[PDB]
Write a protein that binds this ligand. Structure first.
Ligand SMILES: CCCCCCCCCCCCCCCCCC(=O)OC[C@H](COP(=O)([O-])OCC(O)COP(=O)([O-])OC[C@@H](COC(=O)CCCCCCCCCCCCCCCCC)OC(=O)CCCCCCCCCCCCCCCCC)OC(=O)CCCCCCCCCCCCCCCCC
Ligand SMILES: NC(=O)c1ccc[n+]([C@@H]2O[C@H](COP(=O)([O-])OP(=O)(O)OC[C@H]3O[C@@H](n4cnc5c(N)ncnc54)[C@H](O)[C@@H]3O)[C@@H](O)[C@H]2O)c1
Lengths: 60, 417
């Protein structure tokens, strides 16, 4: 009965690969501007997040 | 120095009905006459959205503060104003009664009521637009949204799959070319089909109630249908959106040609808000046919009741109801009204010029400019296939036009000439 003692207040986040899926990336961050062109759209399509993209460009 | 004119009067000499184009005309009227006349303005809505930058607004090249403007800002401080719509108009008596019930007299009447939006023409459409998650999108934002609601910009982004419909209401409707975003979405949705963001089994069709896209300019209307075929977009004419079911995402369309209605599943619905003819303009015997003002095409003066004028969208003029058309309609109204206050003749003629950008790509556009006879100028349909020339003209309208409407309402910058 482990679910009986599970606390649903941890449902505030949906953590997957160290990233919160309920993150409003359409209103905050580099992904907010909708006027991005084909290159910037395909780049965000690959990484799905700005935090992962910025981390890789740091070393590149 | 100058004292503000009073609003608690029984009659005036000039009366402007409207704030979008009725306010800019009054601001240009007083500055030309140096405040020799006491005029009153009576609008209906407190907020004037800048639909001329609607597409750059959906692309979030324009902040919500630069797209939302109050009606009081268009009107100057010397003239009084009141947010009360007119209940009835008596042209034979030269007086106007408001919704409150106070009769106000006038000597000259300038009607700038335009085309009033009616969300009730489509059942359940407004409630599906105000919903922050439903995929029903429209041409204007509801007034119940806060500054943190950006659903308007998710029409093109959140189109992962499903059936998409772009609905055009029955003419006359507001925002004919300035709200045509099916060319910018096609280029973005082409990218989504390349890397799998958009499902390969998706449908997008343009549901147009009218027979043509641009009624008074066949040069631009032929270009649109020619480009829609080259892009691959499917169009269905004589069909208008009738009902939106928010529960199962059902959209009731009806073919006005054959009177046949159907039910279609949708996943991304965009519709230009349909207009509605105001009944009091018919009870006073000012409109004709469709419900637009019956005025002279040259001087913008009404056929009868020579003391009554009309401009903007409410006027029945064989041209595209744009905003730049209103730049050349306020110069004629403020002139002819000045001539009737002095009994002189009317030497101001309106040639029917109207200019509206047509966004042909995500970052490119071309200008739709034409005269009364549908003939275009040197700018008409130029650099229409994209390029550096089309890209530079896009950035000047997307990033540098919304900041200009602040001066238009204040009075710092006048029209193009
Ligand atoms: C020069 C010396 C060189 C020395 C050696 C250098 C080493 C060279 C080898 C290595 C190459 C560099 C590698 C860089 C990549 C590194 C990895 C990386 O960082 O990620 C990729 C990275 C991504 O960049 P980004 O920041 O993400 O892009 C911005 C947005 O994210 C993107 O947002 P978007 O995608 O949504 O939209 C982008 C764009 C939309 O863009 C597009 O859509 C266009 C795409 C068109 C694609 C067409 C494809 C065509 C295919 C080929 C042709 C077809 C075949 C032809 C066949 C012909 C047959 C022969 O929209 C815009 O509105 C653009 C903004 C306005 C334009 C700004 C331009 C600034 C230019 C300033 C200089 C002006 C000089 C003019 C002089 C002209 C004459 C020389 O790419 C780059 O870094 C590009 C290099 C930029 C370096 C900047 C530092 C230098 C500053 C510029 C030079 C200034 C002048 C200096 C000289 C002055 C005296 C002469
Ligand atoms: N895309 C759209 O839906 C849309 C809507 C409005 C304006 N526009 C753009 O703006 C241009 C000019 O706009 P416009 O001024 O002709 O229309 P408008 O709707 O912007 O102006 C009408 C004004 O009159 C007032 N009004 C309406 N009915 C009234 C009544 N009974 N009593 C008192 N006031 C009343 C309104 O409050 C408003 O201030 C248009 O050519 C178009 O380009 C677009």
């Amino acid at each position: 009965m482990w679910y009986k003692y599970f606390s649903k207040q941890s449902w505030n986040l949906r953590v997957w690969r160290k990233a919160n899926l309920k993150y409003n990336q359409d209103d905050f961050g580099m992904t907010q501007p909708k006027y991005i062109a084909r290159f910037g759209d395909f780049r965000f399509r690959l990484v799905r997040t700005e935090g992962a993209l910025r981390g890789c460009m740091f070393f590149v | 120095k100058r004292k503000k004119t009073s609003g608690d009067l029984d009659n005036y000499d000039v009366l402007f009905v409207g704030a979008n184009l009725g306010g800019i005309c009054s601001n240009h009227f007083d500055k030309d006459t140096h405040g020799k006349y006491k005029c009153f303005v009576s609008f209906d809505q407190p907020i004037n959205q800048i639909y001329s930058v609607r597409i750059p607004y959906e692309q979030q090249r324009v902040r919500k503060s630069e797209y939302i403007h109050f009606s009081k800002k268009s009107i100057n401080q010397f003239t009084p104003s009141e947010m009360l719509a007119v209940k009835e108009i008596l042209p034979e008596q030269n007086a106007v009664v408001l919704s409150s019930g106070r009769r106000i007299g006038y000597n000259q009447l300038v009607l700038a009521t335009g085309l009033k939006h009616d969300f009730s023409q489509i059942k359940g459409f407004y409630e599906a637009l105000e919903h922050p998650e439903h995929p029903v999108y429209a041409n204007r934002d509801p007034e119940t949204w806060r500054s943190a609601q950006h659903k308007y910009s998710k029409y093109i982004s959140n189109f992962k799959s499903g059936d998409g419909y772009f609905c055009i209401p029955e003419y006359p409707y507001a925002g004919e070319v300035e709200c045509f975003n099916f060319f910018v979405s096609d280029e973005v949705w082409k990218w989504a089909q390349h890397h799998g963001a958009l499902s390969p089994k998706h449908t997008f069709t343009i549901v147009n109630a009218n027979e043509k896209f641009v009624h008074y300019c066949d040069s631009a209307d032929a270009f649109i249908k020619e480009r829609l075929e080259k892009r691959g977009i499917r169009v269905e004419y004589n069909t208008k959106l009738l009902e939106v079911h928010q529960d199962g995402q059902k959209a009731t369309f009806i073919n006005t040609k054959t009177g046949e209605k159907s039910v279609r599943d949708y996943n991304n619905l965009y519709s230009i808000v349909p207009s509605k003819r105001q009944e009091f303009l018919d009870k006073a015997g000012l409109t004709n046919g469709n419900g637009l003002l019956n005025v002279d095409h040259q001087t913008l003066q009404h056929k009868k009741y020579k003391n009554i004028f009309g401009l903007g969208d409410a006027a029945d003029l064989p041209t595209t109801k744009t905003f730049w058309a209103g730049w050349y309609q306020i110069a004629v109204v403020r002139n002819n009204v000045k001539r009737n206050l002095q009994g002189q003749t009317l030497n101001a003629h309106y040639d029917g010029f109207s200019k509206v950008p047509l966004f042909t790509g995500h970052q490119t556009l071309t200008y739709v400019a034409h005269s009364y006879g549908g003939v275009g100028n040197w700018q008409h349909l130029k650099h229409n296939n994209g390029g550096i020339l089309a890209w530079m003209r896009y950035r000047s309208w997307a990033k540098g036009m919304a900041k200009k409407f602040q001066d238009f309402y204040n009075g710092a910058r006048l029209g193009p000439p």
